[PDB]
Design a protein around this ligand. Structure first.
Ligand SMILES: *[C@@H]1O[C@H](CO[C@H]2O[C@@H](C)[C@@H](O)[C@@H](O)[C@@H]2O)[C@@H](O[C@@H]2O[C@H](CO)[C@@H](O[C@@H]3O[C@H](CO)[C@@H](O)[C@H](O)[C@@H]3O)[C@H](O)[C@H]2NC(C)=O)[C@H](O)[C@H]1NC(C)=O
Ligand SMILES: *[C@@H]1O[C@H](CO[C@H]2O[C@@H](C)[C@@H](O)[C@@H](O)[C@@H]2O)[C@@H](O[C@@H]2O[C@H](CO)[C@@H](O[C@@H]3O[C@H](CO)[C@@H](O)[C@H](O)[C@@H]3O)[C@H](O)[C@H]2NC(C)=O)[C@H](O)[C@H]1NC(C)=O
Length: 370
């Protein structure tokens, strides 16, 4: 398979991006889509030339002696094609867009290659009209995510001459949904200092795929969507968040996935899981240098495949993604001796089974925060 060749690299980047955001901002909500970030910078590398192209692909976790550049783009084409398939009420549409300054011509080679493989959306704007470009960029991302991601870019300089945005429209239905009449406000303990009131869903009729980890200090719940998608909710033991984050590798995800396919762990459960929405918005041009993209955001960057007329330094890149846990899914005679209350911080890993890739990755510290 082409898409199976790029999956190890993309998984590596996901948890590398997580560990950085978790380290630099410890007590805060995290939520992003490694795949939309990977796909967009893989798309952007079609415009980079010689050395600066290698640094992008190597930053994304690819081994350029193992894989060719052709293997990466064919990998992403077969990955995106699989995720765009009709689905069982399941939508995972990865997308990206570049807004280049007017008075800079896109090269035809770039326009063709980006659109033919990644279906990227390329635009001209006048960055001196700062209120205009922000309106133009945000409405495009709003239109493409169908309202779900709004106000992506809050501010921009006038010297800026290119902005990259990446997003993912996500709609999914639970295999086993919750009944909304049984959902009531209950306590959520963010830490030993403070407590918050959140709507808490309840389900004690179904069996679930869940385990209590022998080796690590956490419980892992696996809740399927309808279609080829799944959510891993990892609930660490009290005070042991950063201990689980310390070991949150791609090898660890595949351990929990393989363990939760065994019928041994398919047992009855009184599940209490909150009904909430969090968002994570990330200024990628400031974050990605620390993951080994220092060349792309500098004077020595070579993006002459995008345009020859000017040097393309001082370029911004933004990404936003929202987690929606609802009774249905994302949109708005049973006795249990086993329970799981998600009433303190937990990790979230939305995982595509058809493409073996992490669609979303994040942490829920306070579910109420606007
Ligand atoms: C990045 O990739 C390279 C290349 O990996 C692939 O190369 C293609 C062509 C194909 O052969 C495929 O099967 C390979 O996976 C990795 O480089 C290789 O590293 C291993 C060490 O783990 C080397 O094997 C060793 O060979 C020496 C004798 O030369 C022995 O002493 C050892 O016992 C062992 O067998 C191998 O020579 C390297 N291959 C090449 C083509 O140079 C590289 O490890 C990988 N980076 C990673 C995983 O971080
Ligand atoms: C617009 O781009 C598409 C896809 O571009 C990707 O594929 C190549 C070019 C590579 O550089 C990669 O990095 C790009 O992202 C082009 O579609 C491809 O067209 C070629 C031939 O026109 C096909 O490859 C092979 O061509 C040789 C002869 O040169 C034949 O012997 C082979 O049988 C085979 O046809 C390839 O299948 C196409 N790829 C896809 C994904 O459809 C397209 O040509 C380009 N258009 C323009 C005007 O530049």
């Amino acid at each position: 398979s082409p898409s199976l060749k790029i999956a190890p690299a993309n998984a590596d980047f996901a948890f590398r991006f997580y560990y950085l955001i978790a380290s630099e901002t410890p007590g805060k909500n995290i939520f992003f889509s490694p795949l939309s970030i990977s796909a967009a910078y893989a798309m952007l590398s079609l415009g980079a030339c010689s050395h600066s192209r290698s640094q992008i692909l190597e930053g994304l976790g690819f081994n350029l002696t193992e894989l060719s550049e052709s293997d990466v783009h064919r990998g992403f084409q077969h990955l995106l094609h699989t995720l765009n398939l009709p689905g069982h009420g399941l939508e995972t549409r990865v997308g990206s867009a570049l807004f280049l300054s007017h008075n800079l011509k896109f090269l035809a080679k770039f326009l063709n290659d980006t659109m033919a493989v990644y279906e990227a959306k390329l635009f001209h704007t006048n960055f001196y009209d700062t209120v205009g470009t922000i309106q133009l960029i945000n409405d495009h991302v709003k239109k493409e995510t169908r309202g779900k991601i709004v106000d992506l870019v809050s501010e921009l300089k006038k010297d800026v001459l290119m902005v990259l945005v990446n997003y993912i429209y996500f709609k999914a239905l639970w295999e086993k949904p919750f009944i909304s009449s049984r959902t009531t406000p209950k306590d959520f303990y963010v830490d030993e200092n403070t407590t918050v009131r959140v709507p808490m869903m309840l389900q004690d009729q179904e069996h679930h795929w869940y385990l209590h980890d022998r080796y690590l200090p956490c419980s892992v719940l696996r809740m399927d969507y309808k279609g080829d998608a799944t959510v891993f909710f990892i609930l660490p033991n009290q005070g042991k968040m950063r201990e689980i984050e310390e070991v949150l590798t791609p090898e660890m995800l595949m351990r929990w996935n393989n363990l939760l396919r065994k019928r041994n762990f398919y047992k009855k459960l009184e599940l209490h899981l909150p009904k909430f929405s969090i968002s994570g918005s990330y200024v990628l041009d400031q974050i990605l240098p620390r993951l080994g993209f220092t060349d792309l955001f500098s004077k020595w960057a070579d993006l002459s495949g995008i345009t020859k007329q000017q040097k393309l330094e001082a370029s911004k890149s933004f990404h936003k993604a929202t987690l929606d846990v609802d009774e249905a899914g994302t949109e708005a005679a049973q006795t249990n001796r086993h329970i799981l209350r998600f009433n303190r911080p937990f990790l979230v890993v939305i995982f595509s089974t058809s493409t073996q890739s992490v669609l979303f990755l994040g942490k829920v510290v306070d579910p109420t925060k606007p």
